[PDB]
Amino acid sequence: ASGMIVTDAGADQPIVFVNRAFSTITGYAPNEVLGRNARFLQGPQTDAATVARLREAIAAARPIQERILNYRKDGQPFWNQLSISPVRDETGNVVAFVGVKTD
Amino acid sequence: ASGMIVTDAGADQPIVFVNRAFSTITGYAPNEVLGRNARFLQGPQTDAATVARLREAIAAARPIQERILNYRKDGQPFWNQLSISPVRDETGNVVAFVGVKTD
Ligand SMILES: Cc1cc2nc3c(=O)[nH]c(=O)nc-3n(C[C@H](O)[C@H](O)[C@H](O)COP(=O)(O)O)c2cc1C
Ligand SMILES: Cc1cc2nc3c(=O)[nH]c(=O)nc-3n(C[C@H](O)[C@H](O)[C@H](O)COP(=O)(O)O)c2cc1C
């Protein structure tokens, strides 16, 4: 199974759902992450240019894939092959964002 | 806000998340629907041919949009402009399905 994060569309994209795989991968339980922006997964060695590309894509509701250095709850660095896409209604309104970690 | 349902990919797509708009629209709380296939929203005058097109598209992990008759918890019918899409990882594995109601 691949990790999955779902966020609200607006106002800095707080997490509303993580799948079981997310907790296996990151060591974080759902209650520890709901209502937070996913940027808490980043750490000292995270590439700022990669973070900026995610920021611009999410702001514009553009799909993006990045290999980004993330950090488990226990602090272990892991490479996150991250893909983010908007969820739209048929009018084109953004309803949510979905992020997947590909192992 | 538009209604959104997220399901597992496999084994008859049990619901794993519904947004707040889902509960406003349908009258169901998350604890009433999590772990169930979304077909409980259908009822006696739901169009069988429409349900068959949804079944075939989801089985194939193909996006689909239909206008389908659904029923609130209290039994009141509502027209659901429903769009369902797979969520894939970068290997092409289906991680989840997402369903949206367009007002
Ligand atoms: C649905 C979704 C999932 C995300 N998943 C991750 C993730 O797994 N790891 C990560 O470092 N950032 C993730 N992000 C990105 C951060 O939330 C944030 O958008 C990014 O750090 C850029 O914004 P900032 O410069 O304001 O931090 C995700 C964003 C969204 C919308
Ligand atoms: C993510 C997702 C959301 C769904 N949302 C709805 C819905 O809002 N209303 C509905 O009638 N069916 C919905 N369905 C469809 C049913 O779950 C089911 O796939 C459909 O009734 C066809 O299969 P069946 O013939 O086995 O019932 C959804 C399915 C998925 C995967």
Residue numbers in the entry:
A (entry chain B), B (entry chain A): 48 to 150
Passage from the reporting paper:
Flavin-binding fluorescent proteins (FbFPs), engineered from prokaryotic and eukaryotic light, oxygen, voltage (LOV) photoreceptors, are promising fluorescent reporter proteins. Their small size (about 10 kDa for monomeric FbFPs such as the improved LOV (iLOV) protein derived from Arabidopsis thaliana phototropin photoreceptors) and their oxygen-independent fluorescence make them ideal reporters to monitor transport and anaerobic biological processes. In contrast to GFP-like fluorescent reporter proteins, whose absorption and fluorescence maxima can be tuned by exchanging certain chromophore-constituting amino acids, the absorption and fluorescence of FbFPs and other flavoproteins depends on noncovalently bound flavins, whose structure cannot be influenced by mutation. Using spectroscopy, X-ray crystallography, and quantum mechanics molecular mechanics calculations, we provide a firm structural and functional understanding of spectral tuning in FbFPs.
To verify the transferability of the blue-shifting Q489K mutation, identified for the plant FbFP iLOV, we introduced the corresponding Q148K mutation into the recently presented thermostable CagFbFP protein from thermophilic phototrophic bacterium Chloroflexus aggregans. Much like iLOV–Q489K, CagFbFP–Q148K possesses a blue-shifted S0→S1 absorption band with a maximum at around 444 nm (≈3 nm blue-shifted relative to parental CagFbFP) and a blue-shifted fluorescence-emission maximum (≈6 nm blue shift relative to parental CagFbFP; compare the gray dashed line and solid blue line). To verify that the structural changes, which we observed for iLOV–Q489K, are indeed a consequence of the introduced Q489K mutation and are not due to the observed succinimide modification, we obtained the structure of the corresponding CagFbFP–Q148K variant. Altogether, we were able to obtain three types of CagFbFP–Q148K crystals, all using the precipitant solutions with pH of 6.5 (data and refinement statistics are summarized in Table S1). In all of the obtained models, the C terminus of the protein is clearly unlatched, and the side chain of the introduced lysine is facing away from FMN as was found in iLOV–Q489K. The photophysical properties of the CagFbFP variants are relatively straightforward to interpret.
